[PDB]
Amino acid sequence: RSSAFWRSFPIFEEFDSETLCELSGIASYRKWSAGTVIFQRGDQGDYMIVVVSGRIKLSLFTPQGRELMLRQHEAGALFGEMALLDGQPRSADATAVTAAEGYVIGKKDFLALITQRPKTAEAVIRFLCAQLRDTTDRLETIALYDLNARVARFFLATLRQIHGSEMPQSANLRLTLSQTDIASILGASRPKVNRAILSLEESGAIKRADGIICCNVGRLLSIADPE
Amino acid sequence: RSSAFWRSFPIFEEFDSETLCELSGIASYRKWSAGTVIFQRGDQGDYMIVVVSGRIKLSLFTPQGRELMLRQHEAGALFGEMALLDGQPRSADATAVTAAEGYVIGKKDFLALITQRPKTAEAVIRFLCAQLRDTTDRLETIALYDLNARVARFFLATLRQIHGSEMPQSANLRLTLSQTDIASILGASRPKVNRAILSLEESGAIKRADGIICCNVGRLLSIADP
DNA sequence: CTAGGTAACATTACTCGCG
DNA sequence: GCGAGTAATGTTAC
DNA sequence: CTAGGTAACATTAC
DNA sequence: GTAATGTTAC
Ligand SMILES: Nc1nc2c(ncn2[C@@H]2O[C@@H]3COP(=O)(O)O[C@H]3[C@H]2O)c(=O)[nH]1
Ligand SMILES: Nc1nc2c(ncn2[C@@H]2O[C@@H]3COP(=O)(O)O[C@H]3[C@H]2O)c(=O)[nH]1
């Protein structure tokens, strides 16, 4: 593992070959059995993680028992850099829900590498901005929209992840998220998220078959807004 | 204006004197009458804004009519850098609700300056992280808490907007936010935000006088949990 | 006063191992 | 070439 | 079933 | 005469 394989991961995408070949022989392997906490929120964060295999959910848990799924990263994903760069503790909880393998990079090595190549800093920044945006958008979703609009916006964002700058009239998508997963991402209840999804398929928005959802972009924009 | 005066603003706080004096003769003045839109969300963002005076609210509007107050920046605040660094459009709407004056810095000048001094990049990054955190925390507040807990957490965070450090048992703070302001920050309704605040003062949490609120950190942590 | 949350229950689909 | 734990998906009455 | 939301009105504040 | 809280009902 050393060359154009690292470009797949965020931030590394904008790397030059000089900074990207070498600087990846400072990543140690690490794997986690299904359902294991990689770390907690309070943990000191002196390292960063790339994901090669498995599904790792990053989430926030309140003492009462309620959970908020931040994200469900998978292959080609990168997390664990905020607590790194920024000298504070971890801001979320990382838990592997299946057998997950990935590479690990230390704090000093990474910060010394940012000091080594200035433009890599840019990369980081551009990535951070992006993250912020995705988060803030989600904020809006949960602040100013009902459940149906919430799931509609979720599906639109998930399709815009795959096709990020075109976008058809009908598009299928292979989900890999349970309805409890959705309800926890959007801060709602599983039964009522199920209701909302069935309501959307019965309003002519999305047709849902074994593992697949054909989304009708038209009615989904009509549902994610009013008229 | 070319002094330790720039330190006050975020990001500039971690600046060295060499990068911070000079720097700042590439900032043009601009002022906005009360209630004027500085820009919108869709606008191309090729510049950044520092705030010297007035109160500028950054917020998100949905087409239906519902609003979410992001932030209520004021003197010594800095915004307008995300659309800059990151080549996308603006991510929020900036509107001055009073006569506001502040300095403006162009896109190319700022990015060329980050290319000039590498550590300034680090400054930006740490600032960004911070922002992210503040946002995400707010996310949690509105996802997993009722109204009373929401306002309790808001008051706790705001009293860290001052003593970031320490934190007593009873502390006063001079708000400068209406109850509609609060309800719009936390995505709620003004009447019910009023109810929640009165409920907190009647539960022994906060005593509220003309412009001031004495907060009882103890009962406020008890209210922001359970 | 409507949109939701929480506690129960009834199907329906996977998923192992043993084999 | 089976059953035993789950786990996901809907539904209901508060 | 219940916070939180809508409209409409009431008691204070150069 | 204002902007602002508090209230009520539903
Ligand atoms: N607040 C927040 N943290 C995230 C998000 N996605 C992943 N994380 C991770 O939560 C992790 C907490 O500590 P880190 O600084 O090491 O790295 C962080 C982030 O990379 C997100 O969308 N919001
Ligand atoms: N998404 C988001 N934007 C913010 C926030 N605070 C201020 N803004 C500003 O909204 C503005 C939109 O475009 P910019 O990139 O020019 O700069 C941005 C941010 O600085 C915040 O907390 N979240």
Numbering used by the authors:
A (entry chain A): 6 to 232
B (entry chain B): 6 to 231
Quote the study that presented this structure, word for word.
In contrast, both cyclic nucleotides mediate transcription activation by Sinorhizobium meliloti Clr, mapping to cluster G of Crp-like proteins. We present crystal structures of Clr-cAMP and Clr-cGMP bound to the core motif of the palindromic Clr DNA binding site (CBS). The structures show a Clr dimer that is bound to CBS-DNA. The individual subunits fold into two domains linked by helix α5 (residues P123 to L149), which is the Clr dimerization interface.
The cNMP binding site located in the N-terminal domain is stoichiometrically occupied by cAMP and cGMP, respectively. The binding modes of the phosphate and sugar moieties are identical, involving G85 and E86 within α4 as well as R95 and S96 of the following loop. The side chain of S96 is flipped toward the phosphate only in the cGMP-bound complex. The nucleobase of cGMP is flipped to the syn conformation, while it occupies the anti conformation in the Clr-cAMP complex. While cAMP interacts via its primary N6-amine with both T140 and T141, cGMP forms hydrogen bonds between T140 and its C-6 carbonyl group as well as between T141 and the N2-amine. The latter interaction between the N2-amine of cGMP and T141 of the adjacent molecule is a substantial difference between Clr and the inactive cGMP complex of E. coli CAP. As cGMP is bound in a syn conformation, the interactions can be retained. In contrast to any previous findings in E. coli, we clearly established that Clr performs an identical binding movement via a 140TT motif for both cNMPs. In contrast, cGMP binding by Clr alone proceeds endothermically and with apparently lower affinity (KD, ~24 μM). Compared to the Clr–cAMP–CBS-DNA complex, ternary complex formation with cGMP gives similar affinities and also relies on both contributions.
